[PDB]
Amino acid sequence: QYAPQTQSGRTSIVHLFEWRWVDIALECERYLGPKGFGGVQVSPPNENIVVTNPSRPWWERYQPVSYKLCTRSGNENEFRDMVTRCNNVGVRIYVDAVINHMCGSGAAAGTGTTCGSYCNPGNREFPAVPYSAWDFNDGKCKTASGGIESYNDPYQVRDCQLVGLLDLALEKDYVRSMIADYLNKLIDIGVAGFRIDASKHMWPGDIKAVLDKLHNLNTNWFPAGSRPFIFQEVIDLGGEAIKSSEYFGNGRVTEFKYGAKLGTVVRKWSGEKMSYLKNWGEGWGFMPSDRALVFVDNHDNQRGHGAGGSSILTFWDARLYKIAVGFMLAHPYGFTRVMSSYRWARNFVNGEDVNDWIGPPNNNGVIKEVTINADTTCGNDWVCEHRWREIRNMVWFRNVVDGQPFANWWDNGSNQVAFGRGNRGFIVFNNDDWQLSSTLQTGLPGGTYCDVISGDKVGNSCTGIKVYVSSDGTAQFSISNSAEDPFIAIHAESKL
Ligand SMILES: C[C@H]1O[C@H](O[C@H]2[C@H](O)[C@@H](O)[C@@H](O)O[C@@H]2CO)[C@H](O)[C@@H](O)[C@@H]1N[C@H]1C=C(CO)[C@@H](O[C@H]2O[C@H](CO)[C@@H](O[C@H]3O[C@H](C)[C@@H](N[C@H]4C=C(CO)[C@@H](O)[C@H](O)[C@H]4O)[C@H](O)[C@H]3O)[C@H](O)[C@H]2O)[C@H](O)[C@H]1O
Ligand SMILES: *[C@H]1O[C@H](CO)[C@@H](O[C@H]2O[C@H](CO)[C@@H](O)[C@H](O)[C@H]2O)[C@H](O)[C@H]1O
Ligand SMILES: [Ca+2]
Ligand SMILES: [Cl-]
Ligand SMILES: [Cl-]
Ligand SMILES: [Cl-]
Ligand SMILES: [Cl-]
DSSP, X not given: OOSOOOOTTXXXXXXXXXXXXXXXXXXXXXXXXXXXXXXXXXXXXXXBBOOTTTTSOGGGGGSBSOSOSOBTTBOHHHHHHXXXXXXHTTOEEEEEEOOSEEEETTOOOBSOBSSOOOBBGGGTBBTTTXXXXXXXXXXXXXXXXXXXXXXXXXXXXXXXXXXXXXXXXXTSHHHHHHHHHHHHHHHHHTOOEEEETTGGGSOHHHHHHHHTTOOOOOTTTSOTTXXXXXXXXXXXXXXXXXXXXXXXXXXXXXXXXXXXXXHHHHXXXXXXXXXXXXXXXXXXXXXXXXXXXXXXXXXXXXXXXXXOXXXXXXXXXXXXXXXXXXXXXXXXXXXXXXXXXXXXXOOEEXXXXXXXXXXXXXXXTEEOOOOBOTTSOBOTTBOOGGGSHHHHHHHHHHHHTTTOOEEEEEEOSSSEEEEEETTTEEEEEEOSSSOEEEEEEOOSOSEEEEOTTTOOEETTEESSXXXXXXXXXXXXXXXXTTOSSOEEEEEGGGBO
């Protein structure tokens, strides 16, 4: 469950948050395949309740009403087409599996659902699965309200309702089997693995019991005997009762400490400095690298949901975000996930974005297609960070340097740092309020290399900055603190 099952040599996934299946299929073919991306995390593909107040928020997709593959992203045929087309160009599909719960316990009964299935939340009836009251944890929960009152009590976190959502009785083989049947349908379609939503809210052994029922991956695209990649969403910043490590036996775990601490460092908040990153990884108290799924931001915390707070860097802070994403994609720690977002109208009231519910770009609730501009950006308010040169080229960097060790660290004792990956790549950052002008050991063979942050190698030449590396492996890096992108990255495949 720990191996990502990407094509050999492909080292990242992108979250194409709220994208439609046909757009992802096209994106695999025209972009992600050719640009070396390993895979796509998709939004929940199972039927959800329609939320009309507020009007179609993103988060309605975390309120399941059946396991039918029919959502605002598309129907089952479109989903299958996507998985087929993406796998056929070497880009894997990872599903966001919403398995801890069904919809809100206070929701109305009816067929206000994305495929038209009936449900009666008050009576715990989901006939399209089917589930009945017997399949939920209302009895087992010991709080007066039926909700989680204290994260200090692991029983309540797992057995009570998370924000009022009906909590499935994951101890029951019936429930485990209903979930496995859904996940196995997806595996047989060709999905490579799963993000297990809300894993903190399930017992590790209940998750294990579900995972033990799972098929091997489809041999049209994977070697025989391949197990699905599992990454469990567990928020554990270091000060609550439930630990990430409780989940290591099932697969990887999201390391939320990563983006929280990196954001603080890059923002230079709380006295933090980039020079402190020399021992990034387990030296910062993180989980083992071979258990970690890492990311700068995710779909929750880029809009103030989940955890990390204001330190989280996002596309709204584009300059610093590119620096953080670049550091992450260069550093060997973890398996990397890059976010791909949409814009929304933020409205901060006493520090809270009261528009944090706004759903994807839409015409009257119908999700807009992703249009591609001549300059390779996207229209219709899709941000497409994974198309930014500075991020795409660092996705390629990580593939180029795969397997090479952290090497040749340098810092100025403040916020200028550099390091390499064996003899195959080197990166240099200036996050101080003054000039960087230093001659550094890169670990690379002598030659002239294209800086892949400012440009590209195009045939015989570089379209941006060029770095001349001496025969001894040293090079000067000159980066102004007023630079648009105050970091430079070179690697073996950017050499002229
Ligand atoms: C969002 C994450 O929440 C939890 O994280 C905790 C940390 O665990 C903790 O250490 C600390 O950092 O606080 C964090 C935030 O509280 C959780 O551990 C983590 O898994 C979460 N991310 C996962 C999980 C979910 C669930 O699938 C996603 O949550 C999102 O979707 C929710 C469902 O739509 C959305 O909630 C909306 O709907 C519910 C129903 C509503 N509650 C009202 C309704 C009912 C009855 O119907 C009443 O009984 C309730 O009392 C009412 O409040 C919410 O108000 C509404 O917003 C939620 O906001 C949204 O984040 C998440 O996307 C996943 O990644
Ligand atoms: C300076 O560096 C340290 C790591 O050397 C950062 O501390 C991190 O590591 C410890 C390890 O347990 C953890 O307890 C801290 O919360 C984490 O930040 C400091 O923050 C840097 O100031
Ligand atoms: Ca639960
Ligand atoms: Cl249970
Ligand atoms: Cl357990
Ligand atoms: Cl097999
Ligand atoms: Cl996540």
